[PDB]
Design an enzyme around this catalytic site. Structure first.
Site, PDB file in Angstrom:
ATOM      1  N   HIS A 277       0.784  -1.228   0.000  1.00 51.94           N
ATOM      2  CA  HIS A 277       0.000   0.000   0.000  1.00 51.94           C
ATOM      3  C   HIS A 277       0.819   1.283   0.000  1.00 51.94           C
ATOM      4  O   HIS A 277       2.041   1.257   0.156  1.00 51.94           O
ATOM      5  CB  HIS A 277      -0.937   0.008   1.212  1.00 51.94           C
ATOM      6  CG  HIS A 277      -0.222   0.128   2.522  1.00 51.94           C
ATOM      7  ND1 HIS A 277       0.542   1.228   2.855  1.00 51.94           N
ATOM      8  CD2 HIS A 277      -0.137  -0.718   3.576  1.00 51.94           C
ATOM      9  CE1 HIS A 277       1.068   1.052   4.054  1.00 51.94           C
ATOM     10  NE2 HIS A 277       0.671  -0.120   4.514  1.00 51.94           N
ATOM     11  N   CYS A 295       3.058  -5.004   6.465  1.00 52.94           N
ATOM     12  CA  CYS A 295       2.710  -4.582   5.113  1.00 52.94           C
ATOM     13  C   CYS A 295       3.912  -4.118   4.303  1.00 52.94           C
ATOM     14  O   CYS A 295       4.949  -3.732   4.853  1.00 52.94           O
ATOM     15  CB  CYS A 295       1.667  -3.462   5.159  1.00 52.94           C
ATOM     16  SG  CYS A 295       0.033  -4.040   5.725  1.00 52.94           S
TER      17      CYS A 295
END
EC number: 2.3.2.-
Length: 347
Positions: A277, A295
């Site tokens: 992301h 992440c």
């Protein structure tokens, strides 16, 4: 003349996964009517040569039907009456398949069948799932948990492959009186090969399309405290923006490793909560140091590029981190289970 039904008169437990038929022998079928307990006609077709008749619509559970058929040959006439009772399931389960119908996906997209109940008889479930592939390739079933089963080949799908999945569970006893609530049948195709790789040594996420480098993205992954497991991740859903909530993956927001951040251009590659992301707050670290909870942090420019060029089913491979290996049953970690163990299954 002789008459033959696919059901016996006083039978009990007629599955209902197949239709009911009647065949004439030394004669022709002159009349066939089936009716349910509360009197309605079931509807069916009689073949052109008049030798075979079969129900044309879906029959139901907990139903009491009665067949009346008469065959009249050149010799004489023959008539029979049979009344039977279909299966009355103790419970009903609905399956959901992935990926979507008519969808185009990556080479790592496995076939998925998820039941909204635990399946007592996995063999019965599997046996009721018919998978067609073109070009044909050897594949196998393997359960991720008591509700979801998955099917895949030994190596990644070869581009251009057509996959057809028919879940004919309607009328099937899936164990302990658990019956399929209905049938479902998705169909999809395999597109370009897209393998992205994240090497903790360089901290760059390299995107390869058909073996060719087409993007290099500086990235900051999970920190020593909460690293990013090494392994093969299968691209799942993509979001233009999403509020990531650690509670969703078992970690209370108020906890140490807990969090809740509204991020942009997020592509999910793990059920455990890993996403590729936009992380504008760590572009500084991106490419040099890990600072996330797991992440794959990348610049806002690259996360959007990733959202536009990556499709579900594509692959993201992480290597050399200080973490372990992504769990095979994670949900998008299917490829980390050795073919040997997978092909053997766990039905």
């Amino acid at each position: 003349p002789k008459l033959t039904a696919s059901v016996t008169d006083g039978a009990v437990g007629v599955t209902v996964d197949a239709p009911v038929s009647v065949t004439a022998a030394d004669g022709v079928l002159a009349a066939v009517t089936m009716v349910n307990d509360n009197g309605r006609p079931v509807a069916g077709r009689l073949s052109p040569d008049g030798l075979r008749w079969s129900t044309t619509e879906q029959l139901g559970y907990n139903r009491r039907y009665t067949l009346n058929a008469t065959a009249l040959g050149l010799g004489g006439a023959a008539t029979r009456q049979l009344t039977f009772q279909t299966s009355s399931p103790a419970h009903l389960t609905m399956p959901y398949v992935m990926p979507g119908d008519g969808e185009v996906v990556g080479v790592g997209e496995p076939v998925a069948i998820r039941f909204d109940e635990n399946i007592a008889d996995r063999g019965a479930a599997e046996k009721a799932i018919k998978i067609t592939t073109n070009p044909p390739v050897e594949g196998a079933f393997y359960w991720l948990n008591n509700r979801e089963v998955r099917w895949r080949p030994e190596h990644f799908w070869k581009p251009g492959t057509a996959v057809d999945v028919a879940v004919n569970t309607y009328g099937v006893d899936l164990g302990e009186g658990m019956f399929g609530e209905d049938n479902v049948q998705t169909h999809f195709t395999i597109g370009d090969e897209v393998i992205a790789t994240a090497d903790d040594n360089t901290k760059i996420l390299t995107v390869r399309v058909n073996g060719e480098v087409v993007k290099s993205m500086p990235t900051s992954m999970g920190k020593d405290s909460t690293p990013t497991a090494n392994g093969i991740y299968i691209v799942g859903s993509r979001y233009k923006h999403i509020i990531m909530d650690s509670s969703t993956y078992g970690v209370p927001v108020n906890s140490p490793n807990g969090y809740r951040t509204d991020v942009d251009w997020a592509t999910q590659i793990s059920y455990s909560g890993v996403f590729v992301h936009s992380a504008p707050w760590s572009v500084g670290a991106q490419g040099h140091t890990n600072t996330s909870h797991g992440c794959l942090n990348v610049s806002p420019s690259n996360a959007q590029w990733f959202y536009d060029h990556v499709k579900r089913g594509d692959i993201v491979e992480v290597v050399n981190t200080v973490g372990g290996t992504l769990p095979g049953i994670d949900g998008l970690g299917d490829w980390n289970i050795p073919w040997d163990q997978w092909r053997a299954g766990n039905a």
